[PDB]
Amino acid sequence: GIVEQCCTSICSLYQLENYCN
Amino acid sequence: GIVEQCCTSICSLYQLENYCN
Amino acid sequence: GIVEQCCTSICSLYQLENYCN
Amino acid sequence: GIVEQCCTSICSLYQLENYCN
Amino acid sequence: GIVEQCCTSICSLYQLENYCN
Amino acid sequence: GIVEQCCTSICSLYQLENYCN
Amino acid sequence: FVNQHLCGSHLVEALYLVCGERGFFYVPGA
Amino acid sequence: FVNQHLCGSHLVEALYLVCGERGFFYVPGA
Amino acid sequence: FVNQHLCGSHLVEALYLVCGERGFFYV
Amino acid sequence: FVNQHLCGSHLVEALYLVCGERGFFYVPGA
Amino acid sequence: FVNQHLCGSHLVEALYLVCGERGFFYVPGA
Amino acid sequence: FVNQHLCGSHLVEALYLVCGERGFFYVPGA
Ligand SMILES: [Cl-]
Ligand SMILES: [Cl-]
Ligand SMILES: [Zn+2]
Ligand SMILES: [Zn+2]
């Protein structure tokens, strides 16, 4: 999920937006 | 500047990017 | 909701533990 | 001290409540 | 104490240092 | 610059002020 | 003024700590 | 070390900003 | 109160995230 | 509002940075 | 690397919340 | 891991406090 993706390498704000409701 | 614009009301991500280098 | 409850007056740990999954 | 206990491994709420006054 | 002084008006970092051990 | 200087080891307040405008 | 936005920033940090491995939902105004 | 837990604190704040009024669900490890 | 100071702290965190490698100037 | 509580969060971070290894005591209201 | 410094920043925020009006001592050495 | 990203976030907050009315410029790499 978000930790494995975004704490291993930096997520853009477009990548982050995928995790919004 | 950014304090006047973005503390009086919420700025979007796009609005905030005006202040990037 | 949590904003109505917890931004009007301070929420306790017990109260915060209500918005947990 | 708190740094040895809580920066080596995660501290619970109960454990953090130990450094309170 | 520190809240009455430094949440009413901005404290410098020299003012803040007065509250260190 | 500041990342290399001040994430490899702690910077003092005076060290950090090199990066002010 | 963005008071509710500033509050929410701190609320999510507090939920993160209090909820730990349980997790949480956050959506303003509900 | 507690580095993954520290990262999570920043991630929640980033999600808070990006999602805005939409909100989000967050739980470590899923 | 110091709310403009508080808001500015959150702004610089937001610019840090949004600006990425571009960076920002704050004054 | 919870503005004084929000301020306090920033104050403790500021003291953390300023005091360094010396440490500090903090308690709201005294 | 400043791992212990980064951890402490988050620790003092967590103490601020958990301790509330009781307050807390923070000193890294002890 | 993303520790240089995490440390930069703390650096920005520290420069905000230290620089005061001077302000600062932040651009990773230079
Ligand atoms: Cl705030
Ligand atoms: Cl961190
Ligand atoms: Zn951090
Ligand atoms: Zn704040």
Q: What residues does each domain of chain H span? A: 1-30
Contact G1, B7 (CB under 8 A): yes
| Best residue in K3, K5, K7 for a mutation probing chain F (most F CBs within 10 Å) | K5
> Which whole-number Å values give the CA distances from H3 to A13, E11, F12, K21, K26, in the listed order?
21, 31, 23, 28, 20
Q: Is H23 helix (H, G, I), strand (E, B) or coil?
A: coil
Please give the DSSP secondary-structure letter assigned to residue B13.
Answer: H
Q: Which residues contact B5 (CB under 8 A, 6 or more apart)?
A: B11, B15
Q: Which residues contact E6 (CB under 8 A, 6 or more apart)?
A: E15, E16, I2, J7, J11
Structure tokens belonging to residue E11? 């404290």
Which residues are I24's β-sheet partners?
B20, L26
Name the residue of chain C whose CA is nearest to J1's CA: C8
How would you write H11-22 as a 3-class SS string?
Answer: HHHHHHHHHHHH
- Sign of the Cα torsion K13, A9, B6, H26 reads negative
Residues of G in contact with J2 (CB under 8 A): 7
| CA angle (L19, L25, L26) in 5-degree steps | 110
Q: Which residues contact G29 (CB under 8 A, 6 or more apart)?
A: C1, C3, C4, H21
Which residues are G8's β-sheet partners?
none
What torsion, rounded to 10 degrees, do the Cα atoms B7, B10, B13, B16 define?
A: -30
Residues of F in contact with J20 (CB under 8 A): 10
Cα-to-centroid distance, J17 and ligand 2 (Å): 14
> Which whole-number Å values give the CA distances from E9 to E15, G8, L16, in the listed order?
11, 23, 16
Is I6 close to G6, i.e. CB distance below 8 A?
A: yes
I7 to chain J, closest Cα gap in Å: 10
- Nearest C-alpha neighbor of C11 from the set I17, G8, K28: G8
Is L7 close to K2, i.e. CB distance below 8 A?
A: yes
- Distance (Å, rounded) from C-alpha B17 to C-alpha I19? 6
- Distance (Å, rounded) from C-alpha I5 to C-alpha B11? 17
Which residues are A20's β-sheet partners?
H24
Contact D1, K29 (CB under 8 A): yes
- Nearest C-alpha neighbor of K6 from the set L10, G27, L5, F8: L10
- Distance (Å, rounded) from C-alpha H1 to C-alpha K5? 12
Contact K16, J16 (CB under 8 A): no
User: E strands along chain G, which residues?
Assistant: 24-26
Cα atoms found within 13 Å of the Cα of residue E4, Cβ hemisphere only? 3
- Sign of the Cα torsion K18, K20, K25, K28 reads positive
- Residue G30: Cβ within 10 Å count: 10
Contact G4, C3 (CB under 8 A): yes
